[PDB]
Structures are given as C-alpha cells and as structure tokens.
C-alpha cells in the first residue's frame, strides 16, 4: 500500500519534469517517454527490476531501499537464511 504509493508519486515527479524539459530537447523525449508509453504491467515490471546490481531501473534509491529491506525481512520470516 505505501510502497506503491511512493512509487506512483516518484513516477508522477519524473514524468512532470520530463514534460517540462521536453521543449529544450525534443529528440530525447521520444526515448524517455517509452516508460509512460508501455502498458501498465510492463511499466510495473520494468520499474521493479532494480534487483541485484544491474540497476537499469529508473527508481529512486530510497524507494529501492524500502523494497530491498522488506524483501530481506520476508526472507528472514520465511526462513531462507
């Protein structure tokens, strides 16, 4: 509930600055807006790929840290350590 709320807020932010910055460089906007162009399932998948150190995800570090902490608390609760 709160993780997705923060994710939606940060994706609101990023898109707002991309839209206010599209004028200064129109060419980059075509590649930059594929995230918002993608279907919502693909958007979630690509925005949730920050696992490991590949880090291609356009996700803020705090939002990454929240999920990286919940995912280790869950493993401790599931006895996977």
């Amino acid at each position: 509930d709160d993780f997705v709320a923060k994710l939606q807020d940060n994706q609101r932010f990023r898109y707002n600055e991309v839209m206010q910055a599209l004028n200064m460089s129109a060419a980059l906007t075509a590649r930059k807006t594929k995230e918002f162009r993608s279907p919502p399932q693909e958007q979630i998948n690509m925005l949730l790929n920050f696992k490991d150190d590949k880090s291609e995800c356009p996700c803020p570090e705090e939002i990454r840290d929240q999920l990286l902490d919940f995912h280790e608390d869950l493993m401790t609760h599931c006895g996977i350590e």
Partner: peptide, 19 residues
C-alpha cells in the same frame, strides 16, 4: 502525440489496480 504518450499511466491507475 500527447495522448499516445500518456496512454497507460500507472500514476493515474487507481490504488488497488496498482497494488
């Protein structure tokens, strides 16, 4: 082009759908 860019907004998606 704004409409085609804005199709499928995961921030305009309702909370439960996003969850």
């Amino acid at each position: 082009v704004v409409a085609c860019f804005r199709m499928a907004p995961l921030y305009n998606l309702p909370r439960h759908r996003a969850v």
